[PDB]
Amino acid sequence: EEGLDFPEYDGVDRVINVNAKNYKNVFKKYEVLALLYHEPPEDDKASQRQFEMEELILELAAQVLEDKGVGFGLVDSEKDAAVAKKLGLTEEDSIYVFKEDEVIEYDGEFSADTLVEFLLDVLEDPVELIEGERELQAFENIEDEIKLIGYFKNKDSEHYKAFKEAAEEFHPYIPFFATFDSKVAKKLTLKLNEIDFYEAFMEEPVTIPDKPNSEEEIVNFVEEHRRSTLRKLKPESMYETWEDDMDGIHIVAFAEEADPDGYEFLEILKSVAQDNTDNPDLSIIWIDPDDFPLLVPYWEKTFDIDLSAPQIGVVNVTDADSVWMEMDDEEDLPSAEELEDWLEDVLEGEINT
Ligand SMILES: *[C@@H]1O[C@H](CO)[C@@H](O[C@@H]2O[C@H](CO)[C@@H](O[C@@H]3O[C@H](CO)[C@@H](O)[C@H](O[C@H]4O[C@H](CO)[C@@H](O)[C@H](O)[C@@H]4O)[C@@H]3O)[C@H](O)[C@H]2NC(C)=O)[C@H](O)[C@H]1NC(C)=O
Ligand SMILES: [Ca+2]
Ligand SMILES: [Ca+2]
Ligand SMILES: [Ca+2]
Ligand SMILES: [Ca+2]
Ligand SMILES: [Ca+2]
Ligand SMILES: [Ca+2]
Ligand code: NA
Ligand code: NA
Ligand code: NA
Numbered sequence: 001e002e003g004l005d006f007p008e009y010d011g012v013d014r015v016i017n018v019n020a021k022n023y024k025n026v027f028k029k030y031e032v033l034a035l036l037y038h039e040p041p042e043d044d045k046a047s048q049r050q051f052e053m054e055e056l057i058l059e060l061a062a063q064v065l066e067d068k069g070v071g072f073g074l075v076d077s078e079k080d081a082a083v084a085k086k087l088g089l090t091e092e093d094s095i096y097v098f099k100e101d102e103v104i105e106y107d108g109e110f111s112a113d114t115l116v117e118f119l120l121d122v123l124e125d126p127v128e129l130i131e132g133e134r135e136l137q138a139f140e141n142i143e144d145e146i147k148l149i150g151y152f153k154n155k156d157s158e159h160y161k162a163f164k165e166a167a168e169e170f171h172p173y174i175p176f177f178a179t180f181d182s183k184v185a186k187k188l189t190l191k192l193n194e195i196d197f198y199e200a201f202m203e204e205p206v207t208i209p210d211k212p213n214s215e216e217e218i219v220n221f222v223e224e225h226r227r228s229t230l231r232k233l234k235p236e237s238m239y240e241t242w243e244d245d246m247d248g249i250h251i252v253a254f255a256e257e258a259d260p261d262g263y264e265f266l267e268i269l270k271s272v273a274q275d276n277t278d279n280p281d282l283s284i285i286w287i288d289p290d291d292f293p294l295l296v297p298y299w300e301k302t303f304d305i306d307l308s309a310p311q312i313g314v315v316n317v318t319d320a321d322s323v324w325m326e327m328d329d330e331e332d333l334p335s336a337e338e339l340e341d342w343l344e345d346v347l348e349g350e351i352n353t
Helices: 023-029 044-063 081-087 112-123 133-141 157-168 182-188 215-224 237-245 260-275 296-301 336-349
Strands: 032-038 068-076 094-099 103-104 127-129 147-151 176-179 195-198 230-232 248-254 284-287 311-316 323-325
Touching: 023 081, 032 044, 032 112, 044 068, 044 112, 068 081, 081 157, 081 230, 094 112, 112 237, 112 311, 127 133, 127 157, 133 182, 133 230, 147 157, 147 323, 157 176, 157 215, 176 182, 195 215, 230 260, 260 336, 296 311
Parallel strands: 032 068, 127 176, 147 176, 230 284, 248 284
Antiparallel strands: 032 094, 094 103, 147 195, 248 311, 311 323
């Protein structure tokens, strides 16, 4: 016999050199197009190696997604300046994703797995319809991201169309769900044309006021409620989340969800978030170390902590200086009240913002 190999990177180049002469053709060919806006080659070996790596990561993603009609291209900030201008490419060494009439400024991990998962998400339709019990339960079980759900008469409702337009503005980062089924709406407690917004990790939704809602009303509401009290650092959005600091610091909690102590600590964090949900000055970033294996050594060294145990601290975004709460693993984890008390102590006397 033979034994067929697992798929492997084949070393065939698929990433397109996008330029003035071909960019129109390239957009016609692909339903989803990912473009890396990058700088011309520097004379130093290090920067050249960095670009070499990035381009190869794109090549791998390009091979994986070839059959699904996702295209990958490079736009040189000098050689292709006019193209960049026309497409709105501004952020140096950054990935932009195009689908129909939407442009996405990718602000996530530059890795093949993360990029492929993201682009697969981009390919999906912007609104998820709930009809069956399995789908409803799936909706209800989402906690680690903001989600919206609306009840409409049918797909031809002017108000469903507005909801879908809003959904496209945030696709694929914020899931929008709809139902046309009165029995599903009843379980969700939605009146016709009502839209419920669920903050991450919050049990109770907030209804968008003044229904029926225009596209703008929905987009306005989502933008105002973009930052959850507790938010998870996710590969797909990590840079956006981190760059959104609270007056120069982040409260950061490490917890491994799959670990007994990590799970318990997460439940405590959720309680803290719930009890402070209307405090616009509070945002905690939850990082599950299991999601970022390549950063664990760095974090353990930089923060001087053991990531096999739950941690909570405050980090200065300018220099990564930090302070972490002492917890004895021979004792029970701190209560939500204890955590809040500690945060108050640290943020009151050690913050001159
Ligand atoms: C997060 O971390 C950053 C550190 O990377 C930190 O910013 C630093 O803050 C210090 C505070 O001491 C800045 O230094 C002072 O800034 C004041 C501004 O008013 C100056 O007057 C000071 O100069 C005086 O002090 C100097 C000695 O440090 C003297 O040489 C000078 O003549 C005056 O006496 C001094 O510059 C420091 O420069 C910044 N560095 C930055 C911003 O990069 C920030 O405080 C931390 N943020 C939080 C929220 O904790
Ligand atoms: Ca190019
Ligand atoms: Ca994704
Ligand atoms: Ca209701
Ligand atoms: Ca309205
Ligand atoms: Ca909140
Ligand atoms: Ca990762
Ligand atoms: Na998503
Ligand atoms: Na700062
Ligand atoms: Na985990």
